[PDB]
């Protein structure tokens, strides 16, 4: 591919799931991709598989890891055009009274402050390249979700932070956008479903939450990311929904008393 040829892209959480879909899409578009992930399994295999992708073991919650991620990307490839902040975690369902401030703080560290830290360290280089930031948020930041108060709050923060940073970096020509996936079939989805009483039913429910009648694929999030990096040159501060229409219309969510 040539749509994003000569460009260098960092994808956090890139070893599996949505992240690996985004890595593949960018490689297919002609870019060099640095896969950042805290687990070795998936990311190392992806580096062997894809000419054009390399793996760096990095925990975005560790500032030293992130500093090294950026410095190694520049040392090895000479530029930085796009950061995709995909690293994140969705805990299992929790009733509000079962959450804790400390668990909430830890989830903020992963889902919000890791995105903040890498973006900050990358922006001097993105300014030089007129590059861009893509944050992976979630539809539930916009419309809520039951049994996930901390998770929703973190994604509401990521989406808002995208718009604020877009304002700040617009004079420097650096675009900042987010993607808000709905239900995407991934290893996180399959694991969360396995903890449920009937996993088959939970997956069936997840497919029917979308008018399209299926869950989405990592490749579809990847295509949205490549669009935002390579062809969305008048888009900044937008929230690109990749949800199969989940937010549309009335549904089962629960005569006037
Ligand atoms: N799957 C969905 O339906 C869905 C929906 C909306 C938003 N999202 C978001 O998409 C992103 C990816 O989710 P997924 O479903 O592919 O998850 P996943 O668990 O299948 O993959 C996430 C990847 O990130 C890595 N990771 C986790 N913590 C990390 C850290 N501290 N540093 C670096 N890498 C780390 C994991 O090792 C893993 O490879 C997350 O931000 C998630 O909140 C997912």
Let me know if 151 is a catalytic residue.
yes
Alpha-carbon gap, residue 225 to 78, rounded angstroms: 22
User: Which of 173, 160, 179, 171 minimizes the C-alpha distance to 228?
Assistant: 179
184 annotated as ligand-binding: yes
240 lines ligand 1 (CB under 6 A): no
Q: Is 116 annotated as a binding residue?
A: no
Question: Residue 196, exposed/middle/buried by CB under 10 A (0-12, 13-18, 19+)?
Answer: middle
Q: In angstroms, what is the resolution?
A: 1.7
The CATH architecture to which 1-257 belongs is: 3-Layer(aba) Sandwich (3.40)
**Please, which experimental method was used?**
X-ray
Task: Report the distance separating Cα 188 and Cα 185, nearest Å.
Answer: 8
What is the distance in A from the centroid of ligand 1 to the CA of 82? Answer: 18
* CA 219 to the chain's CA centroid: 13
Give the angle 161-123-106 at the CA atoms, nearest 5°: 45
Whole-Å CA distances, 233 to 117, 158, 172, 239: 24, 21, 13, 15
CA of 179 relative to ligand 1 center, distance in Å: 13
From residue 181, alpha-carbon distances to 20, 178, 233, 236 in Å are 15, 10, 21, 18
């Amino acid at each position: 591919g040539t749509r994003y040829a000569g460009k260098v892209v960092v994808v956090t959480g890139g070893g599996r799931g949505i992240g690996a879909g985004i890595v593949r899409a960018f490689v297919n578009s002609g870019a060099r991709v640095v896969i950042c992930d805290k687990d070795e399994s998936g990311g190392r295999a992806l580096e062997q598989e894809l000419p054009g992708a390399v793996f760096i073991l990095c925990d975005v919650t560790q500032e030293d890891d992130v500093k090294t991620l950026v410095s190694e990307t520049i040392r090895r490839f000479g530029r930085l055009d796009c950061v995709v902040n995909n690293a994140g975690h969705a805990p299992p369902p929790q009733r509000p009274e079962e959450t804790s401030a400390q668990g909430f703080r830890q989830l903020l560290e992963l889902n919000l402050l890791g995105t903040y830290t890498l973006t900050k360290l990358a922006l001097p280089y993105l300014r030089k390249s007129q590059g861009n930031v893509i944050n992976i948020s979630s539809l539930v930041g916009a419309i809520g979700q039951a049994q996930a108060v901390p998770y929703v709050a973190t994604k509401g923060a990521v989406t808002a932070m995208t718009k604020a940073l877009a304002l700040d970096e617009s004079p420097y020509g650096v675009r900042v956008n987010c993607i808000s996936p709905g239900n995407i079939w991934t290893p996180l989805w399959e694991e969360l479903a396995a903890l449920m009483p009937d996993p088959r039913a939970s997956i069936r429910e997840g497919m029917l939450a979308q008018p399209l009648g299926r869950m989405g694929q990592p490749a579809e999030v990847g295509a949205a990311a490549v669009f935002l990096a390579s062809e969305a040159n008048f888009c900044t501060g937008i929230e690109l929904l990749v949800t199969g229409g989940a937010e549309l219309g009335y549904g089962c969510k629960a005569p006037d008393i």
